[PDB]
Amino acid sequence: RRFLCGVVEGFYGRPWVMEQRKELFRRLQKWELNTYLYAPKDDYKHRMFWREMYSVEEAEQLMTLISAAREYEIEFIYAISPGLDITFSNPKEVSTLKRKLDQVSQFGCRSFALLFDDIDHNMCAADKEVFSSFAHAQVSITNEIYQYLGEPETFLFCPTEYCGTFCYPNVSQSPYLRTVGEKLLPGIEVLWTGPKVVSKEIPVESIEEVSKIIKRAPVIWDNIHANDYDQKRLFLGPYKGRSTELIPRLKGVLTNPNCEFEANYVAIHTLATWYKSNMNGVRVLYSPQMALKLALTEWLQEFG
Amino acid sequence: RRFLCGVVEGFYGRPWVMEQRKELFRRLQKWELNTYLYAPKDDYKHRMFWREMYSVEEAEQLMTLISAAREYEIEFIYAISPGLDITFSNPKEVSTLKRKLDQVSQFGCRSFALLFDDIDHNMCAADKEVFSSFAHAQVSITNEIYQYLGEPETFLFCPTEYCGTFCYPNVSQSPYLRTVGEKLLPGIEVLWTGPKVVSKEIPVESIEEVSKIIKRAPVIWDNIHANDYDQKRLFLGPYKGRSTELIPRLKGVLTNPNCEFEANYVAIHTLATWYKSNMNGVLYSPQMALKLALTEWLQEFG
Amino acid sequence: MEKPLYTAEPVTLEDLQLLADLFYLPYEHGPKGAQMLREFQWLRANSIEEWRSRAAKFEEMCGLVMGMFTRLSNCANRTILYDMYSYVWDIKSIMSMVKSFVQWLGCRGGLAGEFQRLLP
Amino acid sequence: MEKPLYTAEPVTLEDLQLLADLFYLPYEHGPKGAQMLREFQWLRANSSEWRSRAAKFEEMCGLVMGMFTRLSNCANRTILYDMYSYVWDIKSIMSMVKSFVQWLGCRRGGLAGEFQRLLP
Ligand SMILES: CC/N=C1/N[C@@H]2[C@@H](O)[C@H](O)[C@@H](CO)O[C@@H]2S1
Numbered sequence: 001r002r003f004l005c006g007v008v009e010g011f012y013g014r015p016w017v018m019e020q021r022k023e024l025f026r027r028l029q030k031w032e033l034n035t036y037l038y039a040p041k042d043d044y045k046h047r048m049f050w051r052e053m054y055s056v057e058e059a060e061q062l063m064t065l066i067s068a069a070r071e072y073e074i075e076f077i078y079a080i081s082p083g084l085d086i087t088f089s090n091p092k093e094v095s096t097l098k099r100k101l102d103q104v105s106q107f108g109c110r111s112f113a114l115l116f117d118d119i120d121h122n123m124c125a126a127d128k129e130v131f132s133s134f135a136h137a138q139v140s141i142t143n144e145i146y147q148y149l150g151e152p153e154t155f156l157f158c159p160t161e162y163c164g165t166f167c168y169p170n171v172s173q174s175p176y177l178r179t180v181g182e183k184l185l186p187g188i189e190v191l192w193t194g195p196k197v198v199s200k201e202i203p204v205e206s207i208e209e210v211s212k213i214i215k216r217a218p219v220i221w222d223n224i225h226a227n228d229y230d231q232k233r234l235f236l237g238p239y240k241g242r243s244t245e246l247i248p249r250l251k252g253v254l255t256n257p258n259c260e261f262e263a264n265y266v267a268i269h270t271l272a273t274w275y276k277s278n279m280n281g282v283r284v285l286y287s288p289q290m291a292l293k294l295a296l297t298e299w300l301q302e303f304g
Numbered sequence: 305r306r307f308l309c310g311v312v313e314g315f316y317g318r319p320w321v322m323e324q325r326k327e328l329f330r331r332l333q334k335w336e337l338n339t340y341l342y343a344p345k346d347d348y349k350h351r352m353f354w355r356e357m358y359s360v361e362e363a364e365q366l367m368t369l370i371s372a373a374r375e376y377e378i379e380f381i382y383a384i385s386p387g388l389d390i391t392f393s394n395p396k397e398v399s400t401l402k403r404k405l406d407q408v409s410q411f412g413c414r415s416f417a418l419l420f421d422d423i424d425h426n427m428c429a430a431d432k433e434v435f436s437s438f439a440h441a442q443v444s445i446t447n448e449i450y451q452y453l454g455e456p457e458t459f460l461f462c463p464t465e466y467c468g469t470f471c472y473p474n475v476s477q478s479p480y481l482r483t484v485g486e487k488l489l490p491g492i493e494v495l496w497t498g499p500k501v502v503s504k505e506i507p508v509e510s511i512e513e514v515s516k517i518i519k520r521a522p523v524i525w526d527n528i529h530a531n532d533y534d535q536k537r538l539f540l541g542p543y544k545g546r547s548t549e550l551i552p553r554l555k556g557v558l559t560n561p562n563c564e565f566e567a568n569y570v571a572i573h574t575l576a577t578w579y580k581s582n583m584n585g586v587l588y589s590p591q592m593a594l595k596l597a598l599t600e601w602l603q604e605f606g
Numbered sequence: 607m608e609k610p611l612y613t614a615e616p617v618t619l620e621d622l623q624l625l626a627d628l629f630y631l632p633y634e635h636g637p638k639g640a641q642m643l644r645e646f647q648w649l650r651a652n653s654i655e656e657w658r659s660r661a662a663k664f665e666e667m668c669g670l671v672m673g674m675f676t677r678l679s680n681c682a683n684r685t686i687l688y689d690m691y692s693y694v695w696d697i698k699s700i701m702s703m704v705k706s707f708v709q710w711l712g713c714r715g716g717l718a719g720e721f722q723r724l725l726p
Numbered sequence: 727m728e729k730p731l732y733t734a735e736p737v738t739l740e741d742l743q744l745l746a747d748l749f750y751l752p753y754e755h756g757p758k759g760a761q762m763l764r765e766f767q768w769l770r771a772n773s774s775e776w777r778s779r780a781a782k783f784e785e786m787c788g789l790v791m792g793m794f795t796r797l798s799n800c801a802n803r804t805i806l807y808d809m810y811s812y813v814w815d816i817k818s819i820m821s822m823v824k825s826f827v828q829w830l831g832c833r834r835g836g837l838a839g840e841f842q843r844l845l846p
C-alpha cells in the first residue's frame with residue numbers, strides 16, 4: 001500500500017543547506033524511508049514572502065536537490081505557507097500561488113503541500129463576506145490548487161487545528177475540522193501532530209477520533225525530537241510512545257527533528273526501525289531501548 | 305611608535321572561515337586597527353598536529369588570506385603552538401618547526417608567534433637533562449626560531465604563566481618569569497592576559513609589576529569578550545576595565561572575542577574607540593563607546 | 607476590504623541597546639538588564655496601586671525583548687541573527703514565560719539546567 | 727625518554743550511550759542521567775555509605791568529561807561542531823558539580839538563566 005515515511009524539515013531557525021539535504025536523502029534511502037517534506041518556516045520564499053519566485057541560482061539549487069531526491073528514490077514534497085498575508089477571495093493571489101508552484105514543478109517537483117499552521121483564525125472583510133468560515137476559504141484554495149496541479153499523487157494539507165489541544169471546542173465537535181472533513185477533496189492528505197504539539201504519546205484512540213471528523217487517516221508530522229522551542233536542549237532518545245498499531249491506521253509519519261542536522265541520526269534511524277517493524281501490518285514488535293542500541297552502534301562508525 | 309592593536313582568533317571551538325577572516329580585516333581597517341593574530345586552538349595544523357605541513361588546497365587558502373591582510377593594511381601574525389608533545393632538545397623537532405614556518409613564509413607571512421600556553425608544566429626526562437627549568441627550554445627554541453627567521457620585526461612569545469593568578473610564587477618573584485625576562489631576546493614581545501585569564505580590570509600597577517620581571521612592556525591578549533568557558537553566554541558589552549593610561553605602558557592589545565564571529569562588532573569597535581582615544585601618551589567612556597558601536601552596527605541589519 | 611500584506615519592521619537602535627544590555631559582560635549585566643532583574647524580584651516579593659504600574663511597565667519591557675527578536679528575525683541580513691540565534695531565542699522565551707507570570711500575579715534548559723538549578 | 731606524540735582515545739559506544747542518556751527525550755531523562763541526578767540530589771541532602779557513593783558519583787562525572795574529550799578529538803569534526811554547545815555545557819556543569827561534591831566531604835548561564843531560576 002501507500003505509506004509516507006521520512007523527515008519533514010519544518011522547524012523554526014536556521015534551515016538546512018543543500019549538502020546537508022542531499023545527505024538526508026542518502027540516509028533516508030539506506031534505512032528504507034521514502035519521503036522528504038520541504039517546509040523550513042524561516043525560508044522567506046516558503047512562508048513570509050511566499051509570493052516571490054526563485055532566482056537563477058535559487059532555482060538552480062532546488063532543481064539539483066529535487067534531482068537528488070529522485071536519484072535516491074525519496075519522494076520530495078514542496079510545501080508552501082501562504083496563510084499569513086494571503087487574500088483568499090482575490091484571484092490575483094490564487095494566480096500568484098499557481099505561478100509560484102508552476103516554477104517549482106519546472107524544477108522537477110510533482111508532490112505538493114499547502115500549510116495553514118501557526119496562523120490567526122480571523123479572515124479579512126473580502127474573505128469574511130465570500131467564505132462562510134476560515135476552514136471554507138482554506139478548503140476552496142487547496143482544492144483549486146489540487147486540481148490546478150493536475151490532481152497529483154501526493155498532495156498534503158496542514159490544518160490550523162493540527163493537534164488535539166488546538167481543536168475548538170474539542171476534536172470531534174470542531175466546525176473547522178468538520179468543514180475540512182467534508183469539503184476537502186479525498187485525494188488530499190491531512191497533517192496531524194497528535195494530542196499536543198509535541199505529543200508524549202500518540203494513542204490509537206486519538207487517531208480514531210481525528211480520523212473520523214477529517215473523513216481520512218492522517219499523515220503524522222511528529223515533533224518528538226524537535227528542539228526549536230528550547231535551543232538549550234537536544235534530543236538523542238529513541239522514537240518512543242507511538243504504537244506499531246498506528247502504522248495501519250495512518251497515511252504516514254514525517255519527523256520534524258532537531259534543528260542541529262547531524263544530531264538526528266538516532267531520531268531518523270529509530271523511526272525507520274519503527275515503521276519497518278510493522279510495515280505490512282493490517283487492522284511487542286518494537287523495543288525503543290533495542291532500537292536505540294542499534295542506532296547508536298551504526299552512529300558510532302560515523303565518528304571515526 | 306609601534307602599537308599592536310587588533311583581534312586574536314585564539315579561542316577553543318570551531319574556527320572562523322576564510323570569508324569571515326577577510327571581512328574581519330575590512331572591519332579592522334575601517335576602525336584604524338592594524339594587527340590580526342592567527343591562533344585558532346582547534347586548527348589541527350596549529351596546536352595538536354603542528355608538525356603537519358599545509359596541504360595544497362590549504363596553502364592556496366592561506367596565501368589568499370595573507371594577501372587580504374596586506375590589501376586591508378592589517379599585519380598578519382601567524383602563531384604556532386607546539387607545547388603539547390614537542391621534545392625541546394631533539395634537533396629533529398626544532399628542524400620540523402623551522403620547516404613549517406618556512407612554508408608559512410612562502411605564503412607571504414612576515415610576522416610570527418610561538419605559543420606555550422595551556423600546556424603541562426612538566427618536561428620529558430630527555431629535555432629535563434638538556435635544559436635547567438621549563439622556561440630555559442622555551443626561551444632556547446624561541447630565540448633560535450627568532451634568529452633562524454631572520455629576527456622578524458614582529459615576533460610574539462606566549463609564556464605558560466600568562467597571567468597573575470598563574471604565577472608561582474607571585475608575579476614579582478616568579479623564577480619562570482625571571483628566566484623569560486633575562487634569557488628571552490629583547491627583540492621578541494611577550495603575551496599577557498592581565499591579572500587573570502578573564503581580567504575584570506587591568507590595573508596600571510599590575511602592568512608595571514609584570515613589565516619589571518619580563519624586562520619590557522607586554523602585548524595584551526585580552527579575554528573580556530571571550531566565551532569559550534560556558535557557550536551559554538554572549539558578550540555584547542563595551543571594552544571596559546582598562547585605563548587609557550595603559551596605552552603608553554603596553555606594546556599592544558589583541559582581543560580574543562566571542563566564538564560567534566558576527567557577535568564581535570561591539571567588542572572590536574569599542575576596542576578601536578579605546579585605543580584611538582589616547583594613542584599618544586576621562587578620554588574614554590564604555591557606556592559612550594557602546595552607543596557609538598551600536599549606532600554603526602544598526603547599519604548591517606537593513 | 608482585503609488582507610494586509612506582511613511587513614517586517616526594521617531593527618531600531620533601541621532594540622540593539624536592549625540586546626547589548628541583555629548580553630553584556632562576563633562580570634556584570636547592562637543597566638537595562640539589571641533594572642529588569644530588579645523589577646521582577648520586587649514584584650515577586652509583593653502580593654498599593656503602585657504594583658499595577660510596575661507590573662504594567664515590566665510587561666511592556668518584556669514585550670520589547672520579544673519585539674527585538676521578531677525584528678532581528680525579520681531583517682534581510684539573517685547571517686547576524688543566525689550567528690547568535692540560540693542566545694536571543696532563549697532570553698525571548700524565558701522573558702515570555704516571565705511576562706505571563708506577572709500577569710497571573712495580578713489574579714526547560716534540560717539536564718544541565720537541572721544540575722545548575724541545585725548549585726548555590 | 728622523549729615527549730610522547732599527541733594521540734586521542736577514539737569514541738566508545740559507551741560514550742554515545744551516556745550522551746544519548748544525557749540529551750534523551752523532551753519528556754524523559756535517559757537512565758544514566760536520571761540516576762546521575764538522584765545521586766547529586768542525595769549527596770546534597772546530607773553533609774557529615776555517603777563517601778562511597780560520592781566516590782562512585784565523581785567517577786560518573788569524569789565519564790561525562792572524558793566523553794566530551796574523546797567526542798572532540800574525533801576525526802569527524804562536522805558531527806562535533808553541530809552539537810558542540812550542548813556537550814560543552816554538559817561537560818562544564820559536571821566539572822562544577824564534581825568540584826562541589828569533592829568539597830562536601832573535604833570541609834554564569836546568562837541573564838536568561840537568572841530569570842529561569844526565579845521560577846517554579
Ligand atoms: C504540522 C504542525 N505544524 C507545526 N508547526 C510548528 C513547527 O514549525 C515547529 O517546528 C514544531 C515544534 O516546535 O511545532 C509546530 S507544529
Ligand SMILES: CC/N=C1/N[C@@H]2[C@@H](O)[C@H](O)[C@@H](CO)O[C@@H]2S1
Pocket residue numbers: 314315316345421422462466495496497501525527530531532533560
Ligand atoms: C595568552 C593566553 N592564552 C590563552 N589561551 C586560552 C584561549 O584559547 C581561550 O580562548 C581564553 C579564554 O577562555 O583563555 C585561554 S588564555
